[PDB]
Design a protein around this ligand. Sequence first.
Ligand SMILES: *[C@@H]1O[C@H](CO)[C@@H](O[C@@H]2O[C@H](CO)[C@@H](O[C@H]3O[C@H](CO[C@H]4O[C@H](CO)[C@@H](O)[C@H](O[C@H]5O[C@H](CO)[C@@H](O)[C@H](O)[C@@H]5O)[C@@H]4O)[C@@H](O)[C@H](O[C@H]4O[C@H](CO)[C@@H](O)[C@H](O)[C@@H]4O[C@H]4O[C@H](CO)[C@@H](O)[C@H](O)[C@@H]4O)[C@@H]3O)[C@H](O)[C@H]2NC(C)=O)[C@H](O)[C@H]1NC(C)=O
Ligand SMILES: [Cu+2]
Length: 223
Amino acid sequence: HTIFSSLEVNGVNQGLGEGVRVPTYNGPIEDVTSASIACNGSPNTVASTSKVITVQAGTNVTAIWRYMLSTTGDSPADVMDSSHKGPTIAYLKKVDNAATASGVGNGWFKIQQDGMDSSGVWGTERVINGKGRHSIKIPECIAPGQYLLRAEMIALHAASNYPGAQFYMECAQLNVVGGTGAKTPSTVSFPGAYSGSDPGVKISIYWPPVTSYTVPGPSVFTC
Ligand SMILES: *[C@@H]1O[C@H](CO)[C@@H](O[C@@H]2O[C@H](CO)[C@@H](O[C@H]3O[C@H](CO[C@H]4O[C@H](CO)[C@@H](O)[C@H](O[C@H]5O[C@H](CO)[C@@H](O)[C@H](O)[C@@H]5O)[C@@H]4O)[C@@H](O)[C@H](O[C@H]4O[C@H](CO)[C@@H](O)[C@H](O)[C@@H]4O[C@H]4O[C@H](CO)[C@@H](O)[C@H](O)[C@@H]4O)[C@@H]3O)[C@H](O)[C@H]2NC(C)=O)[C@H](O)[C@H]1NC(C)=O
Ligand SMILES: [Cu+2]
């Protein structure tokens, strides 16, 4: 239970729910093929926002994860329960108007992921113990313009069966400036890119011990 509730760009937090479509309820999406998998949604209520955040291509944004919209701190208890082990992931989708585009459907490409490392430490744990900061490199080589940024944390503590995995995601609204447009990524659909049978969705993270973890979705796009 957690919310990607604000975005930091160039050392400046852009405001709670400002440029990020945030729900008030921090409950997960559990149907990977629901239309809500893209930018969250029913049975949650997601607020709209008119702010579109400028970001220079090639630089980083940081998704700021918090337990609730009222959370003030940045300690583990302020981010997500430590039982919620799993990957962190981020996607971009080119859209005509980032303030109004739905996000459902084709066009998503992955730009970051953090699964499980050789020490058995998970991406969500690095965010939980890292002040809720989820750093994401905006590629320098993509086309400039309006994008949706989908930042995601998947909790796998109850994922031995499907449904069970818990998907927490929100979409930020970006205006990518300076993008060279020299590369166009191959894209996938949300819903569609994840399946309830994916090795990274239906998984017992306790027995037997996880030796390697396969983050769901396509491979990361890199310039
Ligand atoms: C802009 O955004 C980008 C991302 O979009 C940022 O780049 C990332 O930055 C982070 C943070 O600096 C960095 O974190 C990891 O760095 C090491 C990753 O190692 C890679 O190469 C390995 C090849 O040997 C490979 O095995 C790894 O892949 C494994 O793990 C990942 C998950 O991490 C799995 O998804 C994957 O399948 C595979 O299993 C990586 O590909 C990694 O060593 C780091 O972990 C150490 O520090 C963590 C924090 O303390 C800790 O949780 C972890 O256990 C480990 O600690 C141990 O070593 C520490 C010193 O290294 C020390 O504290 C102790 O001895 C511990 O025992 C870390 O997880 C990403 O790799 C970057 N990603 C990319 C693509 O570059 C960028 O920073 C950001 N800002 C800018 C650019 O300004
Ligand atoms: Cu939870």
